[PDB]
């Protein structure tokens, strides 16, 4: 199904398993069935990965505690300390959207 994988070594492992004359066909079909499904309406994507459970747990923990935060013009407008915006002698201006 012309899928894409997470890491180059993951691709190497998939190629090794897909091509080994001593291996059955169920695992090969499962390998061939891997495909990323993208849902851009909620800004979420899914990828396949092969890891030891410790590595998978670490990767999930890294994924679910990212430090990013949605950005808007009013957020930067509020990023300035209050005792500057509140005063009149200083005026702020923007020139681009976000």
């Amino acid at each position: 199904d012309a899928g894409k994988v997470v890491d180059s070594e993951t691709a190497s492992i998939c190629d090794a398993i897909f091509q080994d004359e001593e291996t059955e066909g169920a695992v090969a079909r499962f390998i061939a069935e891997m495909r990323q499904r993208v849902q851009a309406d909620r800004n979420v994507v899914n990828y396949p990965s092969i890891l030891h459970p410790i590595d998978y747990a670490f990767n999930e923990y890294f994924l679910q505690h990212q430090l990013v935060e949605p950005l808007n013009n009013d957020i930067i407008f509020n990023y300035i300390p209050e005792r500057i915006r509140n005063d009149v002698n200083y005026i702020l201006n923007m020139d681009r959207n976000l």
Partner: protein, 49 residues
């Protein structure tokens, strides 16, 4: 369907159906070799392809 088996990679069914001598019928866009040789038909050749 040959293409389904190829893309999926599950070769068990066709391998068993070939080794255990059970009639089957493969379907797929396959070029064929024209054999204008009756002696080639006498010495059975359409069993090792």
């Amino acid at each position: 369907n040959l293409e389904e088996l190829m893309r999926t990679g599950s070769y068990a069914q066709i391998t068993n159906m070939l080794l255990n001598n059970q009639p089957v019928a493969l379907v797929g866009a396959l070029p064929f070799v024209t054999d204008s040789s009756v002696i080639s038909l006498i010495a059975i050749l359409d069993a090792t392809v």
